[PDB]
From a paper:
To understand the molecular basis underlying the superbinding characteristics of the Legionella [name] domains, we determined the structures of [name] [name] and the L. pneumophila RavO [name] domain in complex with tyrosine-phosphorylated peptides by X-ray crystallography. Compared to the Src [name] domain, [name] is missing two β-strands (βA and βF) but contains a 45-residue insert between the strand βE and the helix αB. This extra sequence in [name] contains a structural motif called the pancreatic polypeptide (PP)-fold, comprising an amphipathic α-helix (named herein as αEF) packed against a polyproline segment via favorable hydrophobic contacts. Indeed, the [name] and PP folds together form a clamp-like structure that grasp the pTyr residue.
Therefore, [name] may be considered a hybrid of two eukaryotic protein folds – [name] and PP. Because the PP-fold occupies the same position as the EF loop in a eukaryotic [name] domain, they may play a similar role in ligand binding. An overlay of the [name] structures in apo and peptide-bound forms identified the PP-fold as the only region in [name] that undergoes a significant conformational change upon peptide binding. Molecular simulation suggested that the motion of the PP-fold was distinct from that of the [name] fold. Therefore, it is likely that the pTyr-clamp in [name] may be able to adjust its conformation to a certain degree to accommodate different peptides. This mechanism of ligand binding may be employed by other Legionella [name] domains of the [name] subfamily.
Numbering used by the authors: 10 to 167
Amino acid sequence: NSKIPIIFGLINSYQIHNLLEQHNAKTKESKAVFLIRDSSTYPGLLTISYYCQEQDIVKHIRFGLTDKGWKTAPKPPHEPLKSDSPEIKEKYTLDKIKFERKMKQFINTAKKLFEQHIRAESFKTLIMELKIHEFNLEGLIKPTRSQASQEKHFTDYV
Ligand SMILES: [Cl-]
């Protein structure tokens, strides 16, 4: 009963950076070190945060509960930039429409599953989706008790 979930609660971008640095993420391969948190943008999803060697930036990938367990969420379009050409802006408009449609359905489904205590295993499906995205599970950063998610769904994600 005293075990701490492996899922972070709400954590800010500054602490995400500093936790990745504490575990030497910037001198390891991308995804060799990562953490799993309650998403601050979409409640009921999870966000996997890691360091991207190729672009020297922290990157995030969202998962959500689906009928078969945790799966990768719809991919958001590339965030706009001051340098964006008309061609990039036009693709953004299309990708964003498609993303918002797909994400709305995905979130609505995830929320309904997240609200129920289902007597079927789901933690293993999170582990499996992490493997599908090639996350070094030995490199999982574990929260302290005060850092960990308070969500009832994650009590046994230990
Ligand atoms: Cl997020």
